[PDB]
Amino acid sequence: MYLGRILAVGRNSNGSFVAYRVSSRSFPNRTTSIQEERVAVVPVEGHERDVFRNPYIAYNCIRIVGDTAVVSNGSHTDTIADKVALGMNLRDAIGLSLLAMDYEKDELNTPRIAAAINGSEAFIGIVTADGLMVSRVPEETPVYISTYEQTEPAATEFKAGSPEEAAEFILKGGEFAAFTHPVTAAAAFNDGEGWNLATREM
Amino acid sequence: RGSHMYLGRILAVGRNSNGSFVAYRVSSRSFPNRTTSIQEERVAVVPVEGHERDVFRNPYIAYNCIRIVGDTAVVSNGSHTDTIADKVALGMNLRDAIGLSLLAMDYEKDELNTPRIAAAINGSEAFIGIVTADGLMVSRVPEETPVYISTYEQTEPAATEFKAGSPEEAAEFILKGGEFAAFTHPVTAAAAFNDGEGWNLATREM
Amino acid sequence: MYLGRILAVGRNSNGSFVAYRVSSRSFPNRTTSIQEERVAVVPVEGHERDVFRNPYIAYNCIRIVGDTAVVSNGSHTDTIADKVALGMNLRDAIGLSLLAMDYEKDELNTPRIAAAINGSEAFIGIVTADGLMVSRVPEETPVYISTYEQTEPAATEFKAGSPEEAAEFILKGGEFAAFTHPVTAAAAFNDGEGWNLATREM
Amino acid sequence: MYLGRILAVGRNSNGSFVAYRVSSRSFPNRTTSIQEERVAVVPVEGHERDVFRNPYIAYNCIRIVGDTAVVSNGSHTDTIADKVALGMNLRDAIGLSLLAMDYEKDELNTPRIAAAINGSEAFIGIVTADGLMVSRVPEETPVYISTYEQTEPAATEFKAGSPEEAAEFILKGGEFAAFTHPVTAAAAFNDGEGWNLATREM
Numbered sequence: 001m002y003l004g005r006i007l008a009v010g011r012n013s014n015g016s017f018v019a020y021r022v023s024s025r026s027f028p029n030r031t032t033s034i035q036e037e038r039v040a041v042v043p044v045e046g047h048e049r050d051v052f053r054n055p056y057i058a059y060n061c062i063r064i065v066g067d068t069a070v071v072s073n074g075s076h077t078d079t080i081a082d083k084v085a086l087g088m089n090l091r092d093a094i095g096l097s098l099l100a101m102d103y104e105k106d107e108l109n110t111p112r113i114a115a116a117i118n119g120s121e122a123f124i125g126i127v128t129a130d131g132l133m134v135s136r137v138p139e140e141t142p143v144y145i146s147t148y149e150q151t152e153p154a155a156t157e158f159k160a161g162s163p164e165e166a167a168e169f170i171l172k173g174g175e176f177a178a179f180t181h182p183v184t185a186a187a188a189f190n191d192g193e194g195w196n197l198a199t200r201e202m
Numbered sequence: 203r204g205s206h207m208y209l210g211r212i213l214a215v216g217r218n219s220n221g222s223f224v225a226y227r228v229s230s231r232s233f234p235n236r237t238t239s240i241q242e243e244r245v246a247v248v249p250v251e252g253h254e255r256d257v258f259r260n261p262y263i264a265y266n267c268i269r270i271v272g273d274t275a276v277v278s279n280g281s282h283t284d285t286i287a288d289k290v291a292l293g294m295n296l297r298d299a300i301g302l303s304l305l306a307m308d309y310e311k312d313e314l315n316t317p318r319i320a321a322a323i324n325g326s327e328a329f330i331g332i333v334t335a336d337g338l339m340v341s342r343v344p345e346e347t348p349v350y351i352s353t354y355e356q357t358e359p360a361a362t363e364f365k366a367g368s369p370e371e372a373a374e375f376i377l378k379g380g381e382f383a384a385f386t387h388p389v390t391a392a393a394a395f396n397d398g399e400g401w402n403l404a405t406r407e408m
Numbered sequence: 409m410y411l412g413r414i415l416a417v418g419r420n421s422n423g424s425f426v427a428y429r430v431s432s433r434s435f436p437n438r439t440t441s442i443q444e445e446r447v448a449v450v451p452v453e454g455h456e457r458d459v460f461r462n463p464y465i466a467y468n469c470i471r472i473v474g475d476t477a478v479v480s481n482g483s484h485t486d487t488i489a490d491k492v493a494l495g496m497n498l499r500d501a502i503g504l505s506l507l508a509m510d511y512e513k514d515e516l517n518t519p520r521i522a523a524a525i526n527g528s529e530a531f532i533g534i535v536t537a538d539g540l541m542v543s544r545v546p547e548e549t550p551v552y553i554s555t556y557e558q559t560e561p562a563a564t565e566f567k568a569g570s571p572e573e574a575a576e577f578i579l580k581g582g583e584f585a586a587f588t589h590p591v592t593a594a595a596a597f598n599d600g601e602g603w604n605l606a607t608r609e610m
Numbered sequence: 611m612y613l614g615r616i617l618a619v620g621r622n623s624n625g626s627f628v629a630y631r632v633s634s635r636s637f638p639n640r641t642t643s644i645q646e647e648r649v650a651v652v653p654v655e656g657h658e659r660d661v662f663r664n665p666y667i668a669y670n671c672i673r674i675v676g677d678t679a680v681v682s683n684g685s686h687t688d689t690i691a692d693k694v695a696l697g698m699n700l701r702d703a704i705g706l707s708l709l710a711m712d713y714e715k716d717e718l719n720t721p722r723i724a725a726a727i728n729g730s731e732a733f734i735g736i737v738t739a740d741g742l743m744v745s746r747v748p749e750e751t752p753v754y755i756s757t758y759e760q761t762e763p764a765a766t767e768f769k770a771g772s773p774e775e776a777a778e779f780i781l782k783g784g785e786f787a788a789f790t791h792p793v794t795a796a797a798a799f800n801d802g803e804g805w806n807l808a809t810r811e812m
């Protein structure tokens with residue numbers, strides 16, 4: 001039931017997207033913030049100092065580089081987006097970044113997850129204490145992955161026609177309604193005219 | 203799927219009640235004139251006498267398929283066997299050695315985008331990996347069971363009750379034993395086995 | 409004369425060490441903090457929010473993993489230290505981490521610098537918009553490198569017999585006295601009985 | 611005076627190029643062969659079996675991928691070219707390939723050298739038992755590097771207006787005339803209308 005941090009990526013009849021949701025037990029005092037071409041997970045007012053207690057709770061969860069949208073549960077969002085910006089195919093950008101940064105060094109060896117999608121293809125990846133996996137996202141269906149339990153891509157009928165709807169869906173919609181401890185969500189959606197961002201709170 | 207019993211190159215890795223091992227088998231349709239050769243701490247896949255020039259026709263048919271570096275055994279379907287073994291020798295955990303090598307070398311640029319597969323195992327752990335046109339995967343080998351993977355069809359680790367108590371038996375098994383008997387076009391096989399007193403090598407022919 | 413962030417690594421008659429110094433014009437309100445097996449560069453009281461303005465000003469500058477000391481001007485200190493901890497020679501740990509993380513995406517394409525040293529060898533590295541370099545530290549002499557100007561290893565007669573002295577030296581000693589805008593420094597020293605840490609302020 | 615394998619890269623008033631020269635003491639029975647978009651170093655008739663004695667003597671020394679020319683002293687020519695073809699900037703393609711493949715495991719720890727150049731930029735690299743280096747080629751001057759002695763980029767007034775002239779020059783021209791044991795050379799030249807290849811023998 002508790003999947004921790006979750007991300008979804010893919011395309012539906014309305015367009016392409018990436019969605020992100022923070023689920024948390026020990027660090028629930030966080031929200032999402034939209035800035036230029038990116039969405040950051042940051043502490044809510046009055047909890048700024050939490051970033052000094054744990055180095056894995058504040059980071060950009062979404063980055064937009066040209067026609068590409070990158071989503072992840074950590075600072076590797078920037079590592080991956082930067083490589084894409086400097087010229088590197090999606091598979092290698094995710095693969096190299098995850099191989100180098102590796103799983104998080106906390107009490108649970110929390111995995112680093114990520115995905116990236118452009119106009120022609122998409123990839124999803126994860127690195128844990130047991131391995132590294134980067135795979136092409138099925139053209140026929142959107143998928144999601146999480147840091148706990150669902151540490152493997154899983155198909156999902158992700159319905160959404162805007163970033164607002166995408167963020168809401170991963171937060172409280174469909175099968176995601178059953179995953180516990182929701183805190184905040186964000187998403188990027190491209191209906192063909194460019195990437196738009198949005199966030200949703202409980 | 204089912205009607206496609208040709209798996210191409212196959213490797214197996216794991217431990218059983220007799221010890222730890224890596225096994226390799228060459229299955230081939232277009233390059234069946236090859237054999238395995240044992241050299242110092244390694245086993246190479248090479249053309250049989252009279253076909254030496256094939257290496258100049260295709261750069262992926264001759265290579266070391268097994269390398270032993272200290273307590274570690276490395277197995278793969280290409281020259282990345284050396285890339286990985288070298289990193290292990292210079293100090294690099296198994297997962298990263300395989301991951302970095304496969305990420306860099308990538309799938310083979312032939313008519314089928316033939317994947318590069320590999321595995322490595324030491325006294326405490328083992329990892330298996332593959333890189334294809336659709337991705338990269340390196341995973342810890344289950345302590346409870348040996349696994350195998352191939353370049354075609356079985357491009358994902360699969361459990362196997364690998365019975366063997368020596369490198370000779372391991373090579374024979376992946377060549378004609380158990381479920382491997384059903385995989386077509388066998389050519390030659392090799393294996394490394396460690397019963398606790400060190401890695402020993404062997405090859406088997408049809 | 410402004411070298412930005414500086415690091416030194418090597419051995420002298422007293423032992424082996426790594427030293428780090430923060431020089432800064434736009435973010436001078438920072439100090440160094442010692443925690444378990446590491447030293448972090450963090451904002452001084454009342455400036456915590458600066459970490460949300462620039463993602464490159466707060467990070468562990470020194471990490472100790474067993475017999476190895478790692479020093480760097482960014483979060484790649486952890487990326488490198490983690491690889492060393494999981495088994496990876498110094499050259500590759502630095503090489504892989506810098507190749508993946510790359511130079512910083514600010515107004516100056518600020519390079520990422522790093523060094524690591526154990527009982528038998530040491531390496532130093534840098535990645536800029538013009539390249540990547542990782543090299544063995546000369547056994548005969550300590551060296552230093554910075555993010556601006558001295559973007560290449562340079563020999564230095566680094567005198568010090570403790571982490572306190574090492575931190576002081578890179579802050580105000582020898583040729584470092586001429587490098588401007590000093591803010592805070594830290595160092596790790598091993599006289600043969602283990603790595604000890606220290607920080608020094610102006 | 612013996613530099614082993616040598617490569618040059620850069621641009622002059624006539625165009626851009628990469629040049630390669632095999633110098634050898636123990637394996638002089640080799641020549642260069644032009645194939646589709648590539649030049650291979652192979653044994654001369656009657657010495658085919660040498661490839662089974664040493665794994666580092668036969669390989670593609672030049673690969674052309676679209677607007678990019680790649681040159682190297684080993685099979686990493688393909689590793690690098692393939693990454694460029696699949697989308698990867700020149701610096702990272704060379705950096706990743708050299709980091710992974712490393713120096714050659716022979717009696718001399720022979721380095722792996724490489725360079726790549728397209729319409730807007732060029733990079734040169736080397737990996738030895740002492741390190742890894744990938745750097746931007748100066749826009750103002752061509753440079754060369756070798757496996758022995760000149761294991762660092764060096765400026766060269768490389769005169770040539772065609773691949774034939776480029777191959778000849780690195781083989782017997784200018785300062786290269788002084789480097790001993792020449793065997794065979796090859797080059798790729800782009801005067802603006804595409805990459806053309808050529809080889810030259812003593």
Ligand SMILES: O=c1[nH]cnc2c1ncn2[C@@H]1O[C@H](COP(=O)(O)O)[C@@H](O)[C@H]1O
Nearest residue numbers: 005023024025026027056057073106110
């Ligand atoms: O948003 C996040 N991304 C990545 N790791 C996180 C995040 N939030 C928490 N963690 C890590 O996961 C552990 C578990 O957090 P929890 O499951 O929410 O209680 C923490 O101690 C952190 O180290």
Ligand SMILES: O=c1[nH]cnc2c1ncn2[C@@H]1O[C@H](COP(=O)(O)O)[C@@H](O)[C@H]1O
Nearest residue numbers: 211229230231232233262263279312316
């Ligand atoms: O032993 C091998 N290892 C890796 N690739 C191979 C090997 N043998 C053949 N190949 C590649 O796989 C393609 C198919 O070989 P085949 O399946 O035997 O017909 C060839 O064109 C080669 O590029």
Ligand SMILES: O=c1[nH]cnc2c1ncn2[C@@H]1O[C@H](COP(=O)(O)O)[C@@H](O)[C@H]1O
Nearest residue numbers: 413431432433434435464465481514518
């Ligand atoms: O300690 C540091 N490590 C890495 N980058 C830094 C650090 N301090 C500042 N920077 C970056 O360098 C730029 C210039 O900083 P300044 O030279 O101190 O004014 C900043 O805008 C940051 O992006």
Ligand SMILES: O=c1[nH]cnc2c1ncn2[C@@H]1O[C@H](COP(=O)(O)O)[C@@H](O)[C@H]1O
Nearest residue numbers: 615633634635636637666667683716720
């Ligand atoms: O063309 C080449 N590229 C890379 N290494 C080579 C080449 N030729 C020879 N070598 C390596 O360099 C060593 C010395 O070659 P030599 O200097 O020509 O005698 C050999 O044993 C090989 O391992």
